[PDB]
Design a protein around this ligand. Structure first.
Ligand SMILES: O=[N+]([O-])c1c(Nc2cccc(F)c2)ccc2nonc12
Lengths: 107, 109
């Protein structure tokens, strides 16, 4: 069983969703080292079945300034996916600041 | 734009600091963690900063931005624009904390 703090990680993105920062909690959860995400679009990591929903969430984030993503699956480093939800906020546009919380174990 | 992320409790104490702080304000994360952000704030701006932290928790997750002068590791006053918002994991009733993006900006126009 994991505490609340331990299932959350912060990330920062340019407006095209490319990672510009990720906190190290992601390693313990999903396997990635932050340095290996940098410059990659978050879209590369969404499950195919969530791509249209996440495109819509990104559009809402950019037009409203904030969004809660709803549940989606992020591809884990060593295979499989984790369920997540993300609260996104645009910093003014300068960048996107995401609070990502894991909803499941790796599947 | 040089910027770094920090997390604070409601009182203003740094509880997480992104390593980009070194390039932005010259301190290591370990020199900021456990200290209040107001301890680095110009005396003219300290109350504005306190009041901003007090209000952001009432704004339902909207961003509140504040400009203030931050004392760099060189003991020089840098203009910072801090954009803050509260977060609480919706599956819990944990007390909100504050997430900040801190950017060195110009005071000019
Ligand atoms: O813009 N974004 O970068 C963004 C997200 N990024 C993200 C952050 C962490 C993991 C992940 F798979 C994706 C995740 C959910 C989002 N909903 O709107 N934008 C989002």
């Amino acid at each position: 069983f994991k505490g609340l703090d331990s299932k959350t990680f912060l990330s920062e993105h340019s407006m095209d969703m490319k990672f510009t920062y990720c906190d190290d909690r992601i390693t313990e959860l999903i396997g990635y080292h932050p340095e290996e995400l940098l410059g990659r679009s978050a879209y590369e990591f969404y499950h195919a079945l969530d791509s249209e929903n996440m495109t819509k969430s990104h559009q809402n984030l950019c037009t409203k300034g904030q969004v809660v993503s709803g549940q989606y699956r992020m591809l884990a480093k060593h295979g499989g996916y984790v369920w997540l939800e993300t609260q996104g906020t645009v910093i003014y546009p300068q960048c996107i600041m995401c609070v990502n919380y894991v909803l499941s174990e790796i599947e | 734009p040089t910027r770094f992320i920090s997390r604070h409790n409601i009182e203003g104490i740094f509880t997480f600091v992104d390593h980009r702080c070194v390039a932005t304000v010259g301190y290591q994360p370990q020199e900021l963690l456990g200290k209040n952000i107001v301890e680095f704030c110009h005396p003219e701006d300290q109350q504005l900063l306190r009041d901003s932290f007090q209000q952001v928790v009432k704004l339902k997750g909207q961003v509140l931005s504040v400009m203030f002068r931050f004392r760099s590791k060189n003991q020089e006053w840098l203009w910072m624009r801090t954009s803050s918002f509260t977060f609480q994991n919706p599956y819990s009733d944990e007390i909100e904390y504050i997430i900040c993006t801190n950017t060195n900006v110009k005071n000019s126009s």
